[PDB]
Amino acid sequence: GQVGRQLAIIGDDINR
Amino acid sequence: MSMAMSQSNRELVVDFLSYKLSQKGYSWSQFSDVEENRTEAPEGTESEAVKQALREAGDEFELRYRRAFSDLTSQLHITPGTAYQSFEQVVNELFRDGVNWGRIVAFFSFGGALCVESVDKEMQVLVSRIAAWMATYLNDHLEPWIQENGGWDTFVELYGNNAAAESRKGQERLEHHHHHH
Numbered sequence: 053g054q055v056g057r058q059l060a061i062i063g064d065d066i067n068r
Numbered sequence: 069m070s071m072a073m074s075q076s077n078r079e080l081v082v083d084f085l086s087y088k089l090s091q092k093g094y095s096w097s098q099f100s101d102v103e104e105n106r107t108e109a110p111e112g113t114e115s116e117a118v119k120q121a122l123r124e125a126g127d128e129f130e131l132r133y134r135r136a137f138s139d140l141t142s143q144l145h146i147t148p149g150t151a152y153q154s155f156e157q158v159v160n161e162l163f164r165d166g167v168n169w170g171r172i173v174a175f176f177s178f179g180g181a182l183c184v185e186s187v188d189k190e191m192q193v194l195v196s197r198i199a200a201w202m203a204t205y206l207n208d209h210l211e212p213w214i215q216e217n218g219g220w221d222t223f224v225e226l227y228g229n230n231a232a233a234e235s236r237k238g239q240e241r242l243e244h245h246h247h248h249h
Contacts, residue, residue: 053154053157053158053161054137054143055140055143055144055157055158055161055178056157056158056159056160056161056162057161058133058136058137059133059140059158059161059162059171059174059178060161060162060164060170060171060174061136061137062129062132062133062136062174063168063170063171063174065132065136066125066128066129066132066170066232066235067169067170067235068169068170068226068227068231068235
C-alpha cells in the first residue's frame with residue numbers, strides 16, 4: 053500500500 | 069443545547085460523496101440511502117462554512133496528490149470484499165499517533181474518489197460501503213477529537229476558503245512582508 057504515506061506528505065505543503 | 073452535533077457528521081460525509089459523483093456524471097442516491105423514509109433535517113448550518121472549506125480543501129488536496137505522486141483509486145483495485153481493507157491501510161497511514169488536522173480533509177476527498185471509480189467499475193454496493201465507513205470513522209475516532217475543541221470551526225479556521233494559499237500569502241507578519249515603512 054503506497055497511499056497514506058504520501059497523503060501525509062502533501063499535508064506539509066498544505067498544513068493550515 | 070445539542071440538536072445535530074452527531075447527526076451532522078453523517079451529513080458532511082453524505083454531502084461530500086453527493087457532489088463527488090455528481091462531478092463526473094453519476095447519481096448518489098441511486099445506490100445510497102435509496103430506502104425512502106428520511107428525516108429532512110432542519111436546514112444544516114454547520115455544513116455552511118464547514119462544507120465550504122471541505123470543497124476547496126478537497127480539490128486542492130487531490131490536485132496535490134496526483135501533482136506530487138499519482139492518483140489514489142488508480143493504484144487501488146476496489147471490490148466488494150477487500151475494499152474496506154484498502155481504505156483501512158490509508159487511514160492508519162495518516163494517523164501517525166493521534167489526530168492532526170489535514171489528514172481529515174485528505175480522508176474526505178480520498179473516500180469520495182473510491183466511490184467514483186467504484187460506480188464506474190460496476191460496484192454500486194461498494195459505494196454505500198464507503199458511505200458507512202466514512203460516516204462511521206467520522207463519528208467514532210474523529211468524534212472524540214473534533215468536539216474536544218470545535219473540530220469544525222477549527223478545521224475551517226485553518227482550511228477556510230483558499231486557506232492553503234492564504235497560509236503563504238495571508239501570512240505577511242512572520243512570513244517576511246516588506247512594508248514596515
